[model samples]
Target: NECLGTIGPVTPLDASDFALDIRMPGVTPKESDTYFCMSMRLPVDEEAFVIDFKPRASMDTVHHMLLFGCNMPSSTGSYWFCDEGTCTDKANILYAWARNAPPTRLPKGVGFRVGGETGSKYFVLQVHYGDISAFRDNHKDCSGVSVHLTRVPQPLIAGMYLMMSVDTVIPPGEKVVNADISCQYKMYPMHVFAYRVHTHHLGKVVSGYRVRNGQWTLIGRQNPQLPQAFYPVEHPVDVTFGDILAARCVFTGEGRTEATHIGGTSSDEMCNLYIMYYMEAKYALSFMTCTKNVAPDMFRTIPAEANIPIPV
Candidate 1:
């Protein structure tokens, strides 16, 4: 509840106003660990900003969901099976939800920019259905995220920069394994705000950082077993373009007798770091990912130590 018309509260927000709900149109999931993407075009009338997101999903079937803002949508049709590149161009991740995570509200005056010629024209909802046991009786899922938008002026544009390693492999019986990824980033400065990590059951500790010169500084480090929401950064880290962005996910076998692969399923694994930041409205970079290259010098801290394995 937020500005009131029917209520007495000072900051009354109606549940129906300034909200867009995009869900599956009575589609039953065929299999477990499936990913489905649906797109909806925004009104061409004016520009807007996405301020927050409230997800609507069933905890039993919905593994995770991501709301993407894209200029060129992945498919012309209503929905499709897709991976991360759900947008053809000018794409950016607006909101993400998983594991009973709470709704996300952006920092003051900062919102995910959309509409008009320069911003996203389409909102794509990618939903991951993880388990089939929940739908034993032919349950149709209408799971998706509800985006909260506003026509008010946004002083800063918010977006997500993902750093991930698609080649992650956790061999059977390994006590400790790391999936690492590094790449260069924006020359323009971005104020690092929030960070979110993703992984399956085996994930231990996930960390992301910026490597400038020969030193590395922490962007954020989190335990993947947690709620998997965006946690605010500790301090001021103005990550400019030219800086080396890197991320690592630490994993353990936990008595799994089979080799686990980087996956397309709920039983598999994933290593990703979502760096949520905001910049000037004109230079906001959306839908950016850092997959690889090499930072040469990558390090992180938790209990006062610096030891990250070198990439070959």
Candidate 2:
């Protein structure tokens, strides 16, 4: 059986004086030796950087901090440092502070953290960034700007596609019909999931269902207020699709977005369903079937997941 889970943004707290520590469970031996990465979009310039990391299961740990796109390796310096410790697979702590310590610093923004033991699935990858001030809020003698932090659970692999097609039509005044898209693939026990449904203004509700033993089980659903991004819809619960794949959507009255289809117009209304499957370990390949007419020029398929031969 396949299981899907997602990690989202975390709260920002004062970690400058304290160490930001995290221990993730569910790593596998097969996922060891892979390079993990994360990202953050900065709203302003950043200063200083720091890191202290350790592995719980294995002895060998390779840890590095990168500033993203830099031409010369020499200019980047060692945002990297190393450590050694012993743990019966309990909790080991790591620390990171600004590079300049009391004065000089790097820019402010999100950065990736990649740590993996030599021969174990025990690995961690996350993006860390914050805005710090020159001094305390009450202390006007502060050095750098005050820091504000916003963090999220970084995706080992982000972006996927799920395509569904409906060749049947619901009669006028009808608000329910089963879509005709069928996808049969074995889902790994550890992987993320996302889906998308394409339909015209007449379409009301688009949903995804897992099929088992000739019965369609509801797993995911979408409504009008949901965001258009990788955010998944809640309803039937998680996804574990085996055997045949089935999804259905409700259609309201023809010519208008009334009846049960609380949808927008073609220019104003947003239709189509998508689910983004995500995880923290290894990234996997996936594609959401592109709904027609949303963006004609945009080619719809799971290109990001397809490109990864294996986790980097």
Candidate 3:
């Protein structure tokens, strides 16, 4: 019944014509923190582009959702648990929506390439349910994202890269702890357009930056408790080979007598920073992540000053 727009908070009337509607085929979960995934085989013989995402869900029920474009999906049948895996072959994260984030649109003349020899034949939609106790009465929850597509080719190609740190080591009885990760850019030259951060309960503030020639440029920073949308960057960043990309997550491990390690659960903590970029290339890069430099060694070459630029 509603679709949000980029830039500002504006909802538009739902129309019957969504280029592609790939949603969970009505499901009532049996466990909390459940992840259900559904795969859709697209007609990829010809080329196409995904311009934007139209998310449909309620804030009280849905935790988050991710749409992955892949050549081979984990399961070809009905929706399955995606905790183990989502894609077996070539894959890339196309879109991620969470925490009541509004729908997002790519910058002008840029879109996610798909079809033909691009190796994106299937789209796997993963929905994470934060709670399921209220759905015991056979309440079917259908939550998913709709794709806005186009046939006309755009000049720039879009892709996403993740800079994350699982080594979020938190000492016991500390009021504040910080974990960071950094990696050099060795792929195609790109211009970053948007950025988003992710973490669990303990995470307080997360920040990302680009270091080129010893100068640090802030990408985007925010508190993890707010909307996890892909925020438009203040300015597009031009990234070439040898440039360093980094992220830092601030946490508080108060009251706990034991150290905390990042894990995949509500009880644990995590630190993730996502950046959406556009480039002029033949195709988008396959799912890319950087953990080569984490915490201790990440700031060896660059002076970290024990900070990742807070309140940026």
Candidate 4:
């Protein structure tokens, strides 16, 4: 069932002004676990900012959808299966969804920039359809995301930064489990205004913090079971160079006979903290994520070779 909600009014753009609508090829979903990816190139002559994002799918067949901005289209063509692992090419996440969520609007004077000869002009949409065997024969899934963009630019450009643990392990019979990961802020100072927490199952509470000069400050915290959307912070936190950005995921492993680790399926688990921040014009890099290393101190600065740069 597709649920609807009341979205606040905005200076709506006309149909001709909408930049793109990337839809699935209307493939009938199978009963088994499946993943699909598609790509589209934006108009090369124009530069615009995404003002609104509306997901077109239901909870019945769609498990989750992620829209990413890439420098070039995927080499695999229209349909490629992938686990929820890192991307080989430079890709920045633009939008994310799980369960059911209403249309999201960019805050005033903040938009995700794309297009133009010099900017990010290519994008890919990845959809995860979790057991849809029930509709294997009849349903034709043309589900995808609709994006609204405009030529008008904003003072502050918005972007997403992911802080996650790919190697999280939660032992059975433990009530509370905590996993931590951290990274250094290498770019210009950012004003973190919104954040979201993500875990597959067994997740209770997930939180993010800014550690600077041995002082810790809360960035955002929420129960992962709630609707997965970006929640604005009570007060925007400023992060600069030398500050350590940390994320902690708390899970519950009570009553389970086996341990849980990170994987793509529902049976396994994941730990992710998404940070939404904005800065002037834009930075050299748009999106980034950190992971644990073999070193004793897990929160070391990401090396230049490890820094993932946004493609021009």
Candidate 5:
């Protein structure tokens, strides 16, 4: 394990634990509406967790950033547009950023684990360039993220679950457009520590809840227009088997004349609620995302129509 440092009796690692430096192509100027991807391998033999993340990009080019951990190399090529292409077999998101947000540090003892002989050895960095036509002549963007990692033996392991919708639509000229979805969590008991909401232009407010015994408990809520950074949960909540995890996204399209559904670009909008949670090491595995195309009862073993309680 690679140790960063300590602070007197505290002895917790900070940003100084940086060991490896992975980056994108330095001289390639990004084009408009491009989804560029690149991969690098970790040199360490033991497992490590990311403690801090700093994006190395300017505002004009970088639309968003996604760091995915892979057990094997995603592709043979160095850089390519993987907009709709599959990059890896077991790809899991390790970190993400958008809207030129500031660097983020994980909470004291919590971090995303990666990089070992049997664990993730390769990582892919995906960057989105919205439109670079304005500075086509002077648009040499060598954008990437500076990640600091540590080898702390965390009691709780953190994972991110992306709960979102793609099948819903928002009518134009409407003040409020809402999309609602729910899923039953069948995993071991986990505690939600933070949340990050994402949307494009029309998104106004997004919220999530835990439904138990026909009651609703607030998880997190945020205005997607603000800086897209992970916010600590005011009150941490626990979720267990059979708990119905629900989310709703509110949108506003008061000016346009046509309906807007979920799409990729800025003109199109999205409803994504990222739930950051932690569980015991025994139940540790790669994180998951439940998209709109998936069935609501997909994770449930017992059918809803049968009216039987699922064993934990």
Candidate 6:
């Protein structure tokens, strides 16, 4: 088993203990503002690592960290391994291990243990750094970088796509920002679970709803800059047939500004979105239609009685 421990830089330690460990084949030092991280490479691939600690005083400066690393030449580089070289770009790889506690004075008479086992090989861990710059520059050799810490933020998803655009017409007074897009969809006896609205910096207000019987009903609403007003805003909006559900971004304009749909940057801004709903497998259709400029009958169809009931 390997042991890693920390002490105040000022305190004198047995030179033999420090020399014996740091002199090993694969050992290196990594430091941050409040602590120093020690990385140890071991040849044993299957056995577990056990860390033991002696209790410390209430305010003793100590490092209660154990870091282990590996380098499987087979598991190195861009695609993990390549014919010639590893992908040195840090964004593509992950490393994993164990941590005991945050950097703070330990409570008097208190310490930590991993129940006789401090590390495991049953699962392989991946270290996730939120930014690419930190991963590539800080480590000695990223190709075999040890898993000490991970800046893994939350799982990322395309929560909402925002579009902001401005356009100047060919002439002055004729300037118009005409942006609009449409998606035609079919409706049936399917269930609608919810509705979500999205808006960003330049957005003033946003609303989405279903239009039926010549009346508009509000499903989701947001006044710009509210704490929970950005990205996804979901509502339990249920509806039956003959309703057209849609969302619109409302921007505050100065002059005779026009409405246009764009996405992303200001100069490249515009709006585009496809309103979607989720239905269970039990409510899925047996026949789906694929349209072309050819004809409507070019699609496959199931009989009327066996088909989905029309939405009310």
| lDDT per model vs. reference | 0.75, 0.31, 0.76, 0.71, 0.70, 0.27
TM-score of each: 0.74, 0.33, 0.80, 0.75, 0.73, 0.31
Q: Which ten residues in a row have the lowest lDDT in candidate 6?
A: 150-159
lDDT of 5 by residue, 166-211 (tens): 7877888887777766777888987888888888888777777777
The CA lDDT at 226 in model 4 is 78
The 10-residue segment of model 2 with minimum total lDDT is 138-147
> Which candidate tops lDDT?
3
Best-to-worst order by lDDT is 3, 1, 4, 5, 2, 6
lDDT of 4 by residue, 124-143 (tens): 88787876865746756766
Judged by whole-model lDDT over C-alpha atoms, candidate 3 comes out at 0.76
What would the TM-score be for candidate 6 when compared with the true structure? Answer: 0.31
Per-model root-mean-square deviation over C-alphas: 6.4, 19.8, 5.9, 8.3, 8.9, 18.4
Spell out the clash pairs found in candidate 3: none
- Candidate 2 residue 83 Cα shift, in angstroms, is 54
Give lDDT tens digits, candidate 2, residues 20-67: 223222222122223222222222123222222221211122221122
Off by over 4 Å in 5: 1-18, 28-35, 44-47, 59-64, 71-75, 82-91, 99-103, 115-119, 128-139, 150-153, 292-312
Local distance difference test, candidate 5: 0.70
lDDT per residue as tens, model 6, 178-197: 22221123544333322223
Give the TM-score comparing model 4 with the true structure, all chains together. Answer: 0.75
- Residue pairs with backbone overlap in model 4: 31-133
Candidate 4 — which residues are off by over 4 angstroms? 1-17, 45-47, 58-60, 72-75, 82-87, 116-119, 130-137, 255-258, 282-284, 292-312
